Amino acid sequence: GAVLHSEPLTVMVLTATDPFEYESPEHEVKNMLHATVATVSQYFHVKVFNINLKEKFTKKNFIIISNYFESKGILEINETSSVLEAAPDQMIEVPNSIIRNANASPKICDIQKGTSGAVFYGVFTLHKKTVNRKNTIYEIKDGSGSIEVVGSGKWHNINCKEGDKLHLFCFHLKTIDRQPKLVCGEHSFIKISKRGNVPKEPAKEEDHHHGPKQVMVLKVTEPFTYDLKEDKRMFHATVATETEFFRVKVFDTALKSKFIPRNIIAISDYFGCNGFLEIYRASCVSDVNVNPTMVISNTLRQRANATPKISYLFSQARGTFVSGEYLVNKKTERNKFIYYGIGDDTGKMEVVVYGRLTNVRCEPGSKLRLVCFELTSTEDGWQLRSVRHSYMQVIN
Amino acid sequence: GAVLHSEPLTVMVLTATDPFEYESPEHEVKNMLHATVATVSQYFHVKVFNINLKEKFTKKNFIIISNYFESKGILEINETSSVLEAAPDQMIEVPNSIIRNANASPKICDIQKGTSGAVFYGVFTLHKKTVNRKNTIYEIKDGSGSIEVVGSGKWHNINCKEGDKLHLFCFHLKTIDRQPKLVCGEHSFIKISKRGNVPKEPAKEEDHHHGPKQVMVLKVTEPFTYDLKEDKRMFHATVATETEFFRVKVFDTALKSKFIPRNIIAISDYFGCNGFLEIYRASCVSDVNVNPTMVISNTLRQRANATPKISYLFSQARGTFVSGEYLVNKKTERNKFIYYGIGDDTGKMEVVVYGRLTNVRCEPGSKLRLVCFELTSTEDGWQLRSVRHSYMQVINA
Amino acid sequence: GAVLHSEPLTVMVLTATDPFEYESPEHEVKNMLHATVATVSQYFHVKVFNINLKEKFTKKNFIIISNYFESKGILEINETSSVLEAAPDQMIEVPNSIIRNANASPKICDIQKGTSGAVFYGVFTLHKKTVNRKNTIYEIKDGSGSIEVVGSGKWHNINCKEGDKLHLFCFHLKTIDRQPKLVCGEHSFIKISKRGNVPKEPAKEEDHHHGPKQVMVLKVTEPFTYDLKEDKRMFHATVATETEFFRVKVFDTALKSKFIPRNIIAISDYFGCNGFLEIYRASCVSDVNVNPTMVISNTLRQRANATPKISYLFSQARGTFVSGEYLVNKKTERNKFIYYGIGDDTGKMEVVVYGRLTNVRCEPGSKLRLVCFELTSTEDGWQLRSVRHSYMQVI
DNA sequence: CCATCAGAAAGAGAGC
DNA sequence: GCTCTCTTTCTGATGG
DNA sequence: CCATCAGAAAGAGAGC
DNA sequence: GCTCTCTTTCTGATGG
């Protein structure tokens, strides 16, 4: 079983986790937490079954232990162990070598080499998840190889997606299906850590792709005419779910009262054309302006209403559409065309405009907003020409 | 059984390694260290199973041994042996010939003529390395031949590379597959004498290569365009083997996903152009588990990602292409041309940029990151010129 | 059997033996030589069976070989192979490490581990020789061990002695009496490289040596008076054992009859002092040469009479006693000191003579033979000064 | 840093 | 007796 | 609705 | 070349 170290050994707390409901070997629903220590030469893992010791398990703190257990190399300190706060003259010196080694996550190829029954600790990016009835196969993967993780009990069907840093605590290796599988035990724990960030502009495809996508109205443009023959009215809008954002082309302006910012909507028939979500009828927008939902975690906000960088545009496919705000400094007018020379702190370029938008009155010395301009380039310099669904307006 | 020498014999300690752990005859995990001693007439290789004698096995120290074993012409000392420091009046003087002839490694061809089970000792050159799943085979070669060595267990893929100088301690000859091999033993030990770096630029080319190669990306950049007429995509990257490093060009932007730093990759049917290696189809990379246990050298990383000095650039043959980072201090724009005089802690030069990359706004005080630039010069200094595959970006504080 | 290497390979010749007789596989005696050649990455041993290639197989020559054979990893050249003369722009740069490994001998401890029939080359010191009726056992030794070498036929009872160097080419391995031995084969060769008789001045010591040392008298001086007051007489002699030479000061001149060149004598109860050997009484020496065969090698004879070069003397410790023959250039005399300028190709110094030896007539152009002079120096140069035991003469 | 390797320089044996 | 040369040796050199 | 701060990880230095 | 540690950077996180 688990041997017993009875010598008063001095240690220092490196890391720890929060109390969480576990199932003790007595079929109760108690609470426990994890932690790691480090002596003058080595480091240990620690299980804590007594939840009243959470104070002395703060990091950068020294404590002396006696009458503690040791199972499979892991120290076990329960409700019958001695954990006392050390004195200023009872501190051990841990070099900055055991510290950077304790928190090192192993390689998966080396998990495929061990014997059955051992314990592991580490964080891994998730490759693919496959939910089953009572467990789930979490395929974690790093540069060293792939392996399977089986999760049942309290960790069956947990809130995570394909790409989360799954920090794992106390898992047993098992030879299942002739391949290395990793199953949990009884003292296990999983803290989830998603690195959620995505700039650029999400472009959902699939034509006739109907359904729901109850997003949130963010920034919108006033309506305008884009076909002077038939006086067709439209306006662009940028909206976002909690995961992504979408640039919307609205062709029925009666939803101007429903495309007000800071509003939440669930919108139906959408056709993924040129990366835009093109609505063709107001009947796809329920007001629903009394039922909350999202919050959009700040960083998504600025991401959606980001103003791109000319350096970033030099690296996009010649045919993609833009939306940003930039400073003008030049202006030449040639036969019905108006070239607006612009640039920022990264690069400069030309912006050509032809058609109705010549009626825009602007001169160097004030900023300018752009929406839905194609990306082109010549031998001389790059360009962002005015297309059919274009729009622009000068600011303060 | 072995033989037992129960009489005092004086020796002079020559070489002595550091303590290392082994699996003793009782399959316990004990400590031992190797040592080479020499009498006035004959030298002797010696084993030390009692690590407490660590101080009395120092070079230039004379000792006397009593009640010590010996096997295959090699002395042994465990816990049941008496080793005593010899006083300065008990000095024996071992000539310089035993010193030059103890560290002399036996020629390989003569190792190809020893009996099955014989034990050897010598430093040799790593000509090619190969790691199995169980053991690890090392093909060594010198002026007399080649021979493979089986390193299983404690010697299953160590920390070394081709071109080093590995010191083999106590490896046994065994006819495997018709040819001799050096299999591991109970008292095996290997200490290294590293060498080889290959800094400077990458390597040469093999036009329309038919072979394969496994490296690891070290510095990838963003994609871009090098042709304005027909929209042609490409991006630069840095890759490396265990020993060599290479700066690569990729023209099918699709292979931007497979080209990530720290990614072990694989490349086949590749072209070579002016120090850079050209790929043309996505059917050349398969980042699907080629070798997980590959260890890249930190100095190699710092050499491939290295940025040369202006003085060093002066000593290069013009025609080689430049990559790295420098700082700007002058800015002079003329007709559709912009000049950026860069400088470092050795001097200053010029950078001539033309065309599309003139649409970038760099200013003195911010660092400029150049990749793939020609190296030209005139009577009035040196330049880095922007060519068909030039790339750069601005980074500041 | 052997395998055949068809492709041209360019090599630099490292070594070659003189030609020697051997028996061919068809039972005919012919000449062959052994060579060692190298490429830029590897060395090879080569057996050369076509003696017309003698001039091509010369050291530091570059040659191009094709249609050659391999047996046990060693190359073989017969009448069917081609060996041409490389052009100057076809030379190769052979690393010195390769020459080092090719000229290196295997250790005996590793030879003893060899499989039966393995072929070896190397140079080893002979420790013991036993000559039987039909073969000879040469027990050789190096720092790693000893092994017996069995020679027969041509290599039976060759003219060598313990201490000589034997260069062995292409000997095979055979187990005899459970002990590994080396044995001669079809292509074996031996070359002898002197022995181990190299002097380096006598030894010191000082205790009353009660032992004897049957030495041969090499050189002697006429008796002379080294103390004028009491008329004390002595002479100097150089003598040699077989491996060593010693300088003897004889203070009992009755031994003059016993010290004659070529006579062999036994010296007992002698005293080392200041690097010389001393004989205080006539009973220490007997005229009987009870070892008529004593042999003093020419290397030891010539080396024992050698006069040290002056520049070499500049490096010697002050206070040592020196004997040598030097050419006299300048002669000046001041208040009973005589200053004789002497010199050789290495340099120039002064011989300072005081007292009785000032009666020796010497003028510029004469050559001075000095025995037992003290080496000293001043700020202006180096001198050889006459002392109590000094002797000198003009030749 | 840890000891190796290499060009230069000194020492031994054969020959004119 | 002198000279050419193979052998042996010390210290500067390499390297990342 | 926005800026500052902080822990981790890649890159570099002193010394072995 | 190898190792401990000082330095620099990208990105996720805080709050009145």
Swiss-Prot record, chain A:
Cell location: Nucleus; Nucleus, Nucleolus; Cytoplasm
Stretches of the chain forming a coiled coil according to its record: none
Knockout mutant characteristics: Deletion mutant mice display increased susceptibility to Staphylococcus aureus pulmonary infection.
Post-translational modifications: Acetylated upon bacterial infection, leading to translocation from nucleus to cytoplasm and subsequent recruitment of STING to activate IFN-beta production.
Record flagged with keyword Cytoplasm: yes
Gene Ontology CC terms: cytoplasm; nuclear inclusion body; nuclear speck; nucleolus; nucleoplasm; nucleus
Region (Interaction with ID2): 330-394
Domain of life per record: Eukaryota
Tissue and organ expression note: Present in osteoblasts (at protein level).
Domain named HIN-200: residues: 1-193, 197-395
GO biological process: activation of innate immune response; cellular response to interferon-alpha; cellular response to interferon-beta; innate immune response; inner ear development; intrinsic apoptotic signaling pathway in response to DNA damage by p53 class mediator; positive regulation of osteoblast differentiation; regulation of transcription by RNA polymerase II
Induction summary: By beta interferon. By macrophage differentiation factors. During myocyte differentiation. By different bacterial infections such as Staphylococcus aureus or Mycobacterium bovis.
GO MF terms held by the record: double-stranded DNA binding; transcription coregulator activity
Keywords, in A-Z order: Acetylation, Activator, Cytoplasm, Developmental protein, DNA-binding, Immunity, Innate immunity, Nucleus, Repeat, Repressor, Transcription, Transcription regulation
Note on domains (UniProt): The 2 HIN-200 domains are able to interact with RUNX2.
Subunit-level organization: Interacts with UBTF. Interacts with RUNX2. Interacts with ID1, ID2 and ID3. Interacts with STING.
Sequence similarity: Belongs to the HIN-200 family.
Its biological purpose: Interferon-stimulated protein that plays a role in several biological processes including cell differentiation, autophagy and innate immunity. Cooperates with CGAS to sense dsDNA and activates the STING-dependent type I IFN pathway. Mechanistically, gets acetylated upon bacterial infection and then translocates from nucleus into cytoplasm to recruit STING for activation of TBK1-dependent IRF3 nuclear translocation and IFN-beta release. Inhibits the transcription of ribosomal RNA. May inhibit DNA binding by UBTF. Inhibits cell growth via p53/TP53 and RB1-dependent and independent pathways.
Protein name as it appears in the record: Interferon-activable protein 204
Gene source species: Mus musculus
Upper taxonomic lineage: Eukaryota, Metazoa, Chordata, Craniata, Vertebrata
Portion held of the full protein: 221 to 616 of 619
